[PDB]
Amino acid sequence: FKTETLTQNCNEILKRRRHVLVGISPFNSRFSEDYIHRLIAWAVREFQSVSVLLAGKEAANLLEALGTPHGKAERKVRKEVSRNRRFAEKALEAHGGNPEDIHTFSDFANQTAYRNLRMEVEAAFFDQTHFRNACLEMSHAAILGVEVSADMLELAVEYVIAELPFFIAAPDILGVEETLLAYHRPWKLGEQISRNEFAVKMRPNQGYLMVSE
Ligand SMILES: O=S(=O)(O)CC(O)CNC1CCCCC1
């Protein structure tokens, strides 16, 4: 795997190798069982600690926006997420990692740190048109992994708002000293956040690490 980071700060966290948060998306062809194992093997080799982030319940929004009825969408997600979990558990066992350090971005709905970060992201979303547009686009890119209408995006964007706290301050939520969220797509919104373009800030102990094989 190769790596690319946003700022020079994301780079400094990278050199310490303390912790990596490996994103696994429920509906993205990237994540074959096989790829999950290779990805996880690499993480455990490269980092002192490895955790895994799966999609929360808002992933149901992506399917609903795409037309799936609510009840079915919720079950489809449960099926896909629990499947991602099973592969990641297996992979973590096999490489010495920790099968319990797998979380979904819904697992902290009642946690102070997570809720506070939701509030910050939400505030910015409603107050700042440029941040709201950025979020809509990021939600559009989530669907792509038929025309995508305005209203499909307002449904889908709940998904983006729910995950973003782990993109800006996962350490607050997970209780680790510092982290890199690791993923195979580039993070456009992350660049703008870097340049202080929004009321939402990237914590100095969070980085984004783009991986590629
Ligand atoms: O829009 S992107 O595809 O760049 C990013 C996105 O929306 C979701 N990516 C996953 C979701 C599940 C947990 C880890 C991150």
Side-chain angles (χ1 to χ4, degrees), residues 93-146 148-158:
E93 291 167 16
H95 296 292
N98 220 343
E100 77 273 13
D101 299 330
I102 301 178
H103 323 278
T104 86
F105 60 68
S106 291
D107 300 347
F108 304 93
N110 291 312
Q111 180 209 77
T112 305
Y114 176 85
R115 295 170 68 86
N116 292 349
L117 300 156
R118 271 293 283 261
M119 272 196 276
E120 171 177 339
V121 170
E122 276 164 10
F125 173 87
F126 296 112
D127 294 355
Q128 298 193 314
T129 310
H130 59 312
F131 181 70
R132 180 164 68 254
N133 292 331
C135 287
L136 298 178
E137 271 174 61
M138 183 174 168
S139 99
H140 187 171
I143 286 179
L144 293 164
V146 66
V148 173
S149 82
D151 294 338
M152 298 178 26
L153 286 195
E154 273 70 36
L155 194 61
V157 79
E158 183 49 43

Side-chain angles (χ1 to χ4, degrees), residues 23-26 53-55 105 138 141-142 159-160 163 167 183 185-186:
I24 294 178
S25 165
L53 184 69
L54 305 185
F105 60 68
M138 183 174 168
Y159 176 94
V160 163
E163 74 181 350
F167 284 72
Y183 201 68
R185 289 196 188 178

Side-chain angles (χ1 to χ4, degrees), residues 172-187 189-200:
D172 285 19
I173 304 166
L174 301 181
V176 303
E177 176 174 4
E178 59 184 9
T179 200
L180 298 170
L181 172 63
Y183 201 68
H184 62 101
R185 289 196 188 178
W187 185 34
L189 186 36
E191 307 169 33
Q192 319 177 244
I193 300 170
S194 300
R195 307 189 287 262
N196 282 19
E197 304 183 19
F198 315 111
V200 169

